[PDB]
Structures are given as structure tokens and as C-alpha cells.
Amino acid sequence: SLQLELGTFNLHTLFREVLNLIKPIAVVKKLPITLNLAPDLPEFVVGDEKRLMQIILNIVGNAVKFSKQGSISVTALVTKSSHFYLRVKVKDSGAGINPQDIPKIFTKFSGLGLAISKRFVNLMEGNIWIESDGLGKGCTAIFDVKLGIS
């Protein structure tokens, strides 16, 4: 039933906007957070801005929410496979995630963010997953989504 709503927007600006919403909260929790955009990351793109924003906001937001100390990095780059694949990696410094808990992370229902993000990523012909090296190692949430180049 779901359908992409396409328009042209500045992808770089979208990342800075997300960081601007999250930063004051990171500051209160004393979690340094960094954004890195690859030198070849397209600027003006065609895609569904409000759905892309929802995905990035919930994953970056989760990093802040579930981290008690340490830093967070948000990295945006291109996955080579007109269109391209945007990759976003969000690495936090949480307590880590047990292997048994990862396969059910998109279906854990308290909490709706990742379930919604998964549908949006699927709409953009993409892939999303979370991984953790275990105790004390935080986790990385990663997604690839297809976007048009303006």
C-alpha cells in the first residue's frame, strides 16, 4: 500500500538538520557526536525526504538514547553497485547488544522506530541491519537506500 513521495532536496542539509535536532540532547547526556559525509556523497538528490528523515532520525536518536557515555559517529557514504545507494552508519558507545537479541530487533513488540524504518528502507529497495561486537562495545546501525541524483 505504501508509495514513495518524491521530490528534490539537499541530502547534506538533511543530515545537518537531524544533527541539529539531536545535538542539544546529546549535549545534556554529554555524548560527543560527529557527522562525516563522504567527499563523493551526492548533494542534490531525488527521493522521499520525509521518510528518509524518519529513518535517520530514529537511528541517530537511538544511539543517543541507548548510550550512557562515550561518543557517537554518523557516517554517510556511497555504496557502489541515474541513481546511487546512500549508506549511513551510526556507531554508538552503548553496553552492546547480545547476539540472541539482534534477530528480533525489528519485531521486539515496546518501540516502533526500527519497524517503521525497515518498511521505509524496503520501499527504497534497500537493506538495514544492526550489529554489535558484544559486551561494552556499543553497536552499529547501518542502512543502504536507493536515491536519484538530481
Ligand SMILES: Nc1ncnc2c1ncn2[C@@H]1O[C@H](COP(=O)(O)OP(=O)(O)O)[C@@H](O)[C@H]1O
Ligand atoms: N543504538 C542502539 N543501542 C542499543 N540498542 C538498540 C539501539 N537501537 C535499537 N536498539 C534496540 O532495539 C529496540 C527497538 O528499537 P526501536 O525500534 O528504535 O524502538 P525503541 O527505541 O522505542 O525501543 C530497542 O528497544 C533496543 O532494545
Ligand SMILES: [Cl-]
Ligand atoms: Cl549498545
